[PDB]
């Protein structure tokens, strides 16, 4: 069998009544087998619960999301992996196992992956998921203050907290801030600006500014590439 009670079967439970208890949380999820850790953020209106398997968490999520509880409409979602980090500027020859081994010095690593592009080539980016937040904080502090080298090449990696973006639920119409400016903005429907109009001119000038940003960022890429190839030469010659 697979490892149970992992962060893959951990659910976020939001919009909780202010009087919620850990036993009430357990009673809410009782049908979905055994429950592990329950943790409620007091006066914040949110909590976490670990279910035994990914199947049980998937089912509980669909079935319990939006459930009315004492005037509240509960929000049940897969919990964002809090103790997760993004690792940038990975050198060559870094396997998922080496990444796990490297970061295992800061604490218990649940998983580590070297990201590969749509053709299996390494992206230079990786993900490190710790079991707990203190271990992830250690890796962040130590890798910023010191130079953490994964291989022979003395180029240290950049470790940043994982950017937590809700690309699942996003921005529903019901949650958009409704005001006069909103209604003014919605008076014109989705359309293509027509050539000759003021809006076509403005939108085309807006596209040109976007194209200018793109060109300037591509110039920085070229300058940094050149700077890096020069440093690699100086380092090899000074050896």
């Amino acid at each position: 069998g697979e490892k149970t009670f992992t962060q893959r079967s951990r659910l976020f439970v939001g919009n909780l009544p202010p009087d919620i208890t850990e036993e009430e949380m357990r009673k809410l999820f009782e049908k979905y087998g055994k429950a592990g850790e329950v943790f409620i953020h007091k006066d914040k209106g949110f909590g976490f619960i670990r279910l035994e398997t990914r199947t049980l968490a998937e089912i509980a999520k669909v079935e319990l999301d939006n459930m009315p509880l004492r005037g509240k409409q509960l929000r049940v979602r897969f919990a964002c992996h809090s103790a997760s980090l993004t690792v940038r500027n990975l050198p060559q020859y870094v396997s998922n196992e080496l990444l796990e081994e490297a970061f295992s010095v800061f604490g218990q690593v649940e998983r580590a992956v070297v990201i590969v592009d749509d053709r299996g080539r390494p992206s230079g980016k990786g993900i490190v998921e710790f079991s707990g937040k203190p271990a992830a904080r250690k890796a962040l502090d130590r890798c910023s203050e010191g130079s953490f080298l994964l291989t022979t090449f003395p180029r240290p990696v950049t470790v940043e907290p994982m950017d937590q973006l809700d690309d699942e639920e996003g921005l529903p119409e019901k949650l958009v801030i409704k005001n006069q400016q909103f209604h003014k903005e919605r008076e014109q429907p989705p359309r293509f600006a027509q050539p000759g109009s003021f809006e076509y001119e403005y939108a085309m000038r807006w596209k040109a500014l976007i194209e200018m940003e793109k060109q300037q960022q591509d110039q920085v890429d070229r300058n940094i590439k050149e700077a890096r190839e020069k440093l690699e030469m100086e380092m090899e010659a000074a050896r």
Binding site: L98, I115, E169
Partner: protein, 255 residues
Amino acid sequence: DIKSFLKPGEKTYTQRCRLFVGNLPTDITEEDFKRLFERYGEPSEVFINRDRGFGFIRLESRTLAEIAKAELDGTILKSRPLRIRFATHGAALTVKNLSPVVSNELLEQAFSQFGPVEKAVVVVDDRGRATGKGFVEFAAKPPARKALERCGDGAFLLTTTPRPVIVEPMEQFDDEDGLPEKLMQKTQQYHKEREQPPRFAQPGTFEFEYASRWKALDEMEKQQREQVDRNIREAKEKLEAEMEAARHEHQLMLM
């Protein structure tokens, strides 16, 4: 009868419900392949390449496909472990430069002009505020291409303010299988690079001196990119002022 586990507003049998299944026995029949997934309800697509040992199956909902994957991935069939992954989405686009008044529903409504949309999402940060980014997944590739071509040539507007949507193919990356150690060839270059273990550069060494130079180079790149962000804010502020003056000019010309 099996539950669908459809979420509110979810479309059925989308590409997000499609599973790639690899490492199947060569003795695999289409009936046995269907049998493997019987517990996950009726499939809408069933494809099997017997000789190549792979197939596709589409389930009714994203939840059923997540369940099937969680339960069956790694299952031993005729001495081989099965590899089950979500199928690469063939018609997904990334959208940028979205106004903060654009909702998932408005983005869907807008992009449905190009053809049937499976899903459209306006991406929000931890605070629940709009990032300006989103994605649009179509049922098929021709509408995605149409949306890509038309939004690149013209200026597609979602609001009164003529802020054009930027449309690009969705970047696909594997953050699941990655680079296993067992598939990495033990060449001399691998050995030279893996000779020294993960470590912090030791003060007073050649490594430390050079790692500090790499930190300096990373800091120069951060500065330069922030300087470009600054140039772009100044240019955007200039464009906004010019366009407010040009709006007044356009309006004052009219009888």
